[PDB]
Amino acid sequence: MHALHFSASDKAALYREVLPQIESVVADETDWVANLANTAAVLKEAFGWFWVGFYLVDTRSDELVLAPFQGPLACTRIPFGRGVCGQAWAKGGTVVVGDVDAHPDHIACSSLSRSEIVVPLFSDGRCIGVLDADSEHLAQFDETDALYLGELAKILEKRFEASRQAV
Amino acid sequence: MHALHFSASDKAALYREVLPQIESVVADETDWVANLANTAAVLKEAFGWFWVGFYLVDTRSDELVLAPFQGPLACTRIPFGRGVCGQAWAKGGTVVVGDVDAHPDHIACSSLSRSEIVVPLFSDGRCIGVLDADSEHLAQFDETDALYLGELAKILEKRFEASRQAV
Numbered sequence: 045m046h047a048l049h050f051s052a053s054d055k056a057a058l059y060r061e062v063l064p065q066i067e068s069v070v071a072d073e074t075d076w077v078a079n080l081a082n083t084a085a086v087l088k089e090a091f092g093w094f095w096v097g098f099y100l101v102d103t104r105s106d107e108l109v110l111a112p113f114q115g116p117l118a119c120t121r122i123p124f125g126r127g128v129c130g131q132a133w134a135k136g137g138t139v140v141v142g143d144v145d146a147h148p149d150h151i152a153c154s155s156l157s158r159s160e161i162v163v164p165l166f167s168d169g170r171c172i173g174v175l176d177a178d179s180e181h182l183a184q185f186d187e188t189d190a191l192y193l194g195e196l197a198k199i200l201e202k203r204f205e206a207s208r209q210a211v
Numbered sequence: 212m213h214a215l216h217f218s219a220s221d222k223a224a225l226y227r228e229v230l231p232q233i234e235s236v237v238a239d240e241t242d243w244v245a246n247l248a249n250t251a252a253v254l255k256e257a258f259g260w261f262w263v264g265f266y267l268v269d270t271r272s273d274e275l276v277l278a279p280f281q282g283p284l285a286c287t288r289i290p291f292g293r294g295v296c297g298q299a300w301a302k303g304g305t306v307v308v309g310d311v312d313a314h315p316d317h318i319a320c321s322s323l324s325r326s327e328i329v330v331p332l333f334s335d336g337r338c339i340g341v342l343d344a345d346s347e348h349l350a351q352f353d354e355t356d357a358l359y360l361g362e363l364a365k366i367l368e369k370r371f372e373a374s375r376q377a378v
């Protein structure tokens with residue numbers, strides 16, 4: 045059975061400890077939802093963010109649809125271009141928000157969130173979904189999170205491709 | 212935005228408070244995984260159990276496959292008939308475990324859980340998955356949990372069927 049150690053006190057060092065563990069945990073499963081669910085579990089345990097999880101693109105509706113996550117209840121559907129999530133999708137790149145109250149068109153599924161980061165995932169150069177993380181603290185996410193969650197996105201993208209191949 | 216109230220300080224009273232809120236939240240989405248994810252979130256926030264979430268039957272492999280959940284990372288696959296989860300599937304009914312150490316063939320995905328409840332979900336007669344909840348406390352789950360998580364199971368079953376008819 046897999047088990048996770050994370051000892052490191054500095055943010056960047058904790059990512060360097062956590063990412064290889066995630067890689068190992070998801071290497072062992074083809075099911076995409078299972079892998080997203082365990083990913084978000086590892087992130088929540090390691091970093092303690094208020095909310096962390098995924099939305100996946102629905103090509104039929106041009107909406108992000110809620111997938112696995114840790115934290116309180118969330119909105120199920122985010123239109124293309126709306127919110128930090130829909131902005132990330134539209135831009136094709138990561139969005140870091142130091143103060144959600146000061147950010148344009150943030151969607152507040154929780155009144156409690158104050159900062160956020162959204163990292164898009166791609167297959168064949170099309171966005172398939174986003175990783176979203178939220179904090180109750182202002183400015184919880186910075187370039188360290190963008191770098192390492194971007195690397196995690198790459199690891200997950202490969203698992204998405206494995207999930208398609210496994211059908 | 213959907214938004215939850217938990218006042219109740221007694222377990223049974225809290226189920227009575229929370230089940231209608233879950234029913235409302237899941238009524239307004241057809242995607243099965245989104246609904247499971249938000250249900251796990253509501254249960255985790257309301258009851259604070261160590262782990263709460265779902266496994267879904269994979270008919271290709273005769274295994275339960277990890278779906279949305281809250282709590283630490285978990286096993287991705289449980290064979291038919293193995294563990295509390297596989298036993299609930301094989302029995303076609305709820306299994307309540309007061310102490311995972313006296314239970315035959317408990318699967319310990321975390322070393323920290325001490326008590327558990329599994330409630331199966333059905334469609335067209337057959338098991339489609341299970342709700343599993345785990346606690347670090349002994350005997351956290353009793354007849355109140357069996358009753359009300361069984362009613363939750365039926366609420367969810369109706370959403371599974373609605374997911375198949377949605378367009």
Ligand SMILES: C[S@@](=O)CC[C@H](N)C(=O)O
Pocket residue numbers: 095118119122126127128129130149150151152153154157160176178
């Ligand atoms: C999980 S919840 O915070 C998702 C919506 C997001 N804040 C956004 O602005 O898109």
Ligand SMILES: C[S@@](=O)CC[C@H](N)C(=O)O
Pocket residue numbers: 262285286289293294295296297316317318319320321324327343345
């Ligand atoms: C989430 S984890 O505890 C799942 C396995 C379960 N205890 C079982 O015995 O089937």
Ligand SMILES: [Mg+2]
Pocket residue numbers: 069070073078079082083287
């Ligand atoms: Mg996994």
Ligand SMILES: [Mg+2]
Pocket residue numbers: 080081082084085112113114279280281282
């Ligand atoms: Mg999860």
Ligand SMILES: [Mg+2]
Pocket residue numbers: 115116117215252253254256257
């Ligand atoms: Mg909640």
Ligand SMILES: [Mg+2]
Pocket residue numbers: 240241242243244246370371373374
């Ligand atoms: Mg549904």
Ligand SMILES: [Mg+2]
Pocket residue numbers: 120236237240245246249250
């Ligand atoms: Mg829902």
Ligand SMILES: [Mg+2]
Pocket residue numbers: 112113114115247248249251252279280281
């Ligand atoms: Mg969840």
Ligand SMILES: [Mg+2]
Pocket residue numbers: 273291
């Ligand atoms: Mg069978």
Ligand SMILES: [Mg+2]
Pocket residue numbers: 307308309310326327349350351352353
């Ligand atoms: Mg018990």
Ligand SMILES: [Mg+2]
Pocket residue numbers: 222258351352353356
């Ligand atoms: Mg209980």
